[PDB]
Amino acid sequence: WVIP
Amino acid sequence: WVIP
Amino acid sequence: SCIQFTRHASDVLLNLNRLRSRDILTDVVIVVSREQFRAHKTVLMACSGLFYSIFTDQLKCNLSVINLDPEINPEGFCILLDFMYTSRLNLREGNIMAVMATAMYLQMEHVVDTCRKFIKASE
Amino acid sequence: SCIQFTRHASDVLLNLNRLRSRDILTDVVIVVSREQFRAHKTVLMACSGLFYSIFTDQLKCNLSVINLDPEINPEGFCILLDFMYTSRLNLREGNIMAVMATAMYLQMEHVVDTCRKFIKASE
Ligand SMILES: CSc1ncc(Cl)c(Nc2ccc3c(c2)CC(=O)N3)n1
Ligand SMILES: CSc1ncc(Cl)c(Nc2ccc3c(c2)CC(=O)N3)n1
Ligand SMILES: [Cl-]
Ligand SMILES: [Cl-]
Ligand SMILES: [Cl-]
Ligand SMILES: [Cl-]
Numbered sequence: 001w002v003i004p
Numbered sequence: 005w006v007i008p
Numbered sequence: 009s010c011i012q013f014t015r016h017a018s019d020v021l022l023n024l025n026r027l028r029s030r031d032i033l034t035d036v037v038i039v040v041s042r043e044q045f046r047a048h049k050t051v052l053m054a055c056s057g058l059f060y061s062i063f064t065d066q067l068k069c070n071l072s073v074i075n076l077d078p079e080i081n082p083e084g085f086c087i088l089l090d091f092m093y094t095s096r097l098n099l100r101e102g103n104i105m106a107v108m109a110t111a112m113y114l115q116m117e118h119v120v121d122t123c124r125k126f127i128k129a130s131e
Numbered sequence: 132s133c134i135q136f137t138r139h140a141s142d143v144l145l146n147l148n149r150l151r152s153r154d155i156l157t158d159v160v161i162v163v164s165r166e167q168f169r170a171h172k173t174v175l176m177a178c179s180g181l182f183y184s185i186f187t188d189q190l191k192c193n194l195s196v197i198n199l200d201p202e203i204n205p206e207g208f209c210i211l212l213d214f215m216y217t218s219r220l221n222l223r224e225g226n227i228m229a230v231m232a233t234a235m236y237l238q239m240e241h242v243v244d245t246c247r248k249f250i251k252a253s254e
Contacts, residue, residue, distance in 0.1 A: 001122050004096065004135040005245050008012040008219065009221070013241055016218035017140035023177035032187060033173055050156055050171055054146035064155060095139035098132070118136055 018095075024051055025093040038089075039075045043082035045089055055092040057115025077113060084110035091119065099126060141218075147174055148216040161212075162198045166205035168212055178215040180238025200236060207233035214242065222249060 027033060027048070034046040049069075052059035062068045076085065084106035091097045097119060099107060108123035150156060150171070157169040172192075175182035185191045199208065207229035214220045220242060222230060231246035 001097075001134045001136055004133060005011045005013055005220075008010060009223070010219035011222055011245065012219050013214075013245075014218075016214075016241075017144040020174070020177045020215075021140040021143055023183075024173060027173060027176065033176070033192070048173055050147060050150060050173060051143070053150065053156070054143045060146075069156070091136075091139075092143075095137075096133035096135050099134055100132070118139075122134065122136075 021093065021095065024048065028093055035072065037073050038085070039073060040080050040082040040085045041078060043085075045085065047089060047092075051092055055114075055116060057117075058113065060115075080110055080113060081106040088114060088116065088119065091116075097122070099123070101130075144216065144218065147171065151216055158195065160196050161208070162196060163203050163205040163208045164201060166208075168208065170212060170215075174215055178237075178239060180240075181236065183238075203233055203236060204229040211237060211239065211242065214239075220245070222246070224253075 028046070028051075031046055034048055036047055036049050036052070038045045038047060038052075049059070049063045053063050054060075062074060068074075083103060087098050087103060087107055088110055097107075099122070104123055104126060108120060108127070111119035111123060151169070151174075154169055157171055159170055159172050159175070161168045161170060161175075172182070172186045176186050177183075185197060191197075206226060210221050210226060210230055211233055220230075222245070227246055227249060231243060231250070234242035234246060
């Protein structure tokens, strides 16, 4: 999971 | 396009 | 000896979401506490262990309406349906418990994992 | 304020290809010079400008069989159908002209672009  |  | 187009999968999903937003070729209604959500059976199966099991069943594969368990929260379902079609999860302090419970019921392992981690950080 | 799962789109496409390989919920046959290819209308639309136009048509959206132009090569179509469901293109010296012509007919702009570039390098 990432900060888009 | 890339070499997978 | 194949070549690969990096953005292809993302572009496919973006177009599937455009079809969903315009209600094109949607073939099922998911009913959650009277709230109704239109979707594509194939996308639901590709994202959820529960929908995969439902639509591979020889009788249920033909149903145009699926009713979820009454304990399922419509907002939690909406957030997860949005994630299915976009890869983006709107996870907030106020919805995390409903999102995790809905993801456990829908069998969406990666969502359950990130909810468990975000909950553990707050304790 | 969403979080994003990097591998989600790729995982969705991988599952859609697993459904194709097991012939699960395929809803159309594409006929190419008597060769037949089963597929999902939504995936075809998501990858091709031609299928997008066909299945948004109020009459054609209901057809279970679509016949392509007789000039279309079945091998070129097979390679492109594989690309649609995997992001991988089996581009070879012996098939590049048939693949480019099929991609131009199917309106798959990124495939047409890589074929033009590979052809230009060989001249
Ligand atoms: C297992 S083979 C397979 N073949 C095709 C499909 Cl459409 C599919 N979907 C599916 C099954 C289980 C799970 C998910 C999707 C998401 C998750 O967390 N668990 N699986
Ligand atoms: C244009 S809006 C839109 N909405 C939904 C879909 Cl399913 C769609 N597909 C599509 C249209 C045109 C093209 C492609 C896909 C691939 C390509 O090269 N050109 N387009
Ligand atoms: Cl029904
Ligand atoms: Cl998931
Ligand atoms: Cl027909
Ligand atoms: Cl393309």
